[PDB]
Ligand binder design. Structure first.
Ligand code: 1SY
Lengths: 362, 372
């Protein structure tokens, strides 16, 4: 990964205007806008900052805004006599770890770590990591401090997972659900149903009678917002924009669904698995596909984890989910995980995801 | 907890006679019966220990009676040992169990080898001793058990034997993702009983209709409680039990019967972009009603807690799975108990093994009859 992923995990990312801890309007990864109590005043600074917003900005814009902050923070480091020698000595990864401290505490704050910085400069990682864990910075935010400290000691991104909650949930959804339905048959073999009776065909080849409504995609889209912002329930067309931001032509078809897979498990006869609602996008001909949200994400959110820990586990969830997908045999391109930093980012990620699945078939 | 749960996690517990690493017949928590290769000799030796006709199958309270007999004998040998008596006497109750844990694993002569580590414990240098113990071969050979025993020495608490544990995530999984969803429709007693091939005015769990009592008995009673079975070793049966296979699924659950034709109505809900996902259609089980010694029965809905089966598929080390599943029951009971309107609608049946669950089910169902 990179320094951007590091701070999104440790600090978080917001693509809507929010009030920070002291109440001042901020965007992206902790980018201060104004000390004015006028929501419009901050928006005016935001509009000129990107040159476009209505208070909402995109992912690659927030990463463009982040790099502007990164260079300015590095600029101040070179202007600070206590932080210049250590930065010059550090390697690429450990430079990001020091930059994280400046983003959290300010250049004046990081300069206070006189003893800890000298141990880093003399490449005494174990010695420095023990001293950093004794500070007030560690006591205030130990989850973030542990990962930044672990980054200094080892120089790797390893802190950012066999017994992780996120990887266990990715293991939970694959073995306890997706593997069951995939064992039944192929995705193109899965029958399409109307809530009417229709011989509506299958996902791979929709029947000519179905073509009332065009192509249908035999791909299960599993949506994973990396901030855990999953909408509850299923959206009606009125609420569709609330559930799925920035999906231009998206529509929801409650009356159509993919047939569920019946299983016997844990003392339950005919447990229903993998019943999907069919959604469409503009291809006025449209593209129908079955998609659903990654349901462990909603449950892990209910555990009330610390915000950075929730982002850490969801990051492990997607990392292992893709790995299990890569090792999948005889089920090539049937499961696609749509990853987004926020719920809105998923909406834009859905559009390209469906386009790339069309191109492989067409 | 206590020393019994500590060793039950670290070593495991068996209620059937088994051969240990060296081939000797054993019961409970590493309790040697005989060095004879004759299974009958071991069964007779077990009978003399318990004062019963066991045939090799033992209960929890019997295995804990045998465990404390090993504990006292192990403490006695320690007090007879000049290298271990000063350190044992200085330690507190919890840290004493940790020292007893090492004796159970490697023997008094083995534990006596830790000359440097034991002296740090005697003069209360916890952090220093925990670092020195982690340098031994005992740590490299058995790292999961050594880590928990070392943490017990360092902190003097049972915290190592079960905040974001894998077991608690699965316990949150079943509560937030299933049980809470089903209960959001209404109370458990309001849930209707359904027949497979017919329409039956069968009533609800809280109020069984007169037609239901016509088919299954005029003294039949139905409990509006969902019994969630939790085997603490992860032994969950595959699939659903048939009438013939009932004994395999539920060992030593006396008079148990299964009614495939009866089921609790499923709850349809909207989740994760799914319209009307079907939830909680349960199989109805019955037991003979000890209330009135008759043929009248007690009907209840029962199923296994399937995250236990899911957690097993992650291929954890035996002791690590026991730690996580114990955390699962701790978080599952905590979530159920703290509910403000669903406290006695869900009852979690905990057992040390699958056989232990079979006897635990009866106690659970009898306990619900008296409450209602
Ligand atoms: N999109 C989707 N469609 C499904 O049909 C489905 N079924 C399961 N899952 C998810 O895969 C994983 C399988 O784990 P498990 O079954 O052990 O725990 C489940 C199980 O203990 C219980 N549960 C939920 N739904 C059912 C059900 N229909 N039958 C029996 N038990 C259920 O509650 C737990 C959490 O369910 P979800 O939190 O919604 O997510 C599960 C889970 O993350 C599904 N995901």
């Amino acid at each position: 990964m990179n320094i951007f992923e590091m701070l999104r995990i440790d600090q978080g990312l917001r693509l809507k205007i929010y009030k920070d801890t002291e109440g001042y309007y901020t965007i992206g990864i902790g980018h201060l806008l104004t000390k004015s109590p006028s929501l419009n005043a901050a928006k005016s600074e935001l509009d000129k900052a990107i040159g476009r917003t209505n208070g909402v900005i995109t992912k690659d814009e927030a990463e463009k805004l982040f790099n502007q902050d990164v260079d300015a923070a590095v600029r101040g480091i070179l202007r600070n006599a206590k932080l210049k020698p250590v930065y010059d000595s550090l390697d690429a990864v450990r430079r990001a770890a020091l930059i994280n401290m400046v983003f959290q505490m300010g250049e004046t704050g990081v300069a206070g770590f006189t003893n800890s910085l000298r141990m880093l400069q003399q490449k005494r990682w174990d010695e420095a990591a023990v001293n950093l864990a004794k500070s007030r910075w560690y006591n205030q935010t130990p989850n973030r401090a542990k990962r930044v400290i672990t980054t200094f000691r080892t120089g790797t991104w390893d802190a950012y997972g066999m017994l992780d909650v996120g990887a266990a949930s990715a293991q939970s959804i694959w073995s306890g659900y997706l593997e069951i339905i995939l064992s039944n048959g192929a995705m193109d073999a899965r029958k399409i149903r109307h809530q009417q009776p229709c011989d509506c065909g299958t996902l791979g080849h929709p029947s000519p009678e179905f073509k009332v409504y065009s192509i249908v995609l035999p791909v299960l889209f599993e949506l994973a917002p990396l901030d855990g912002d999953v909408p509850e329930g299923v959206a009606t067309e009125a609420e569709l924009a609330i559930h799925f931001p920035e999906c231009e032509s998206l529509k929801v078809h409650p009356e159509l669904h993919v047939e569920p897979v019946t299983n016997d498990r844990a003392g339950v006869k005919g447990r229903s698995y993998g019943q999907h609602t069919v959604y469409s996008l503009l291809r006025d001909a449209r593209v129908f596909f079955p998609m659903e949200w990654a349901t462990p994400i909603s449950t892990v959110k209910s555990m009330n984890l610390e915000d950075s820990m929730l982002r850490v586990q969801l990051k492990a969830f997607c990392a292992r989910f893709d790995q299990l997908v890569s090792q999948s045999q005889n089920h090539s391109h049937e499961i696609k995980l749509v990853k987004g930093l926020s719920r809105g980012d998923v909406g834009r990620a859905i559009i390209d995801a469906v386009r790339e699945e069309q191109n492989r078939l067409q």
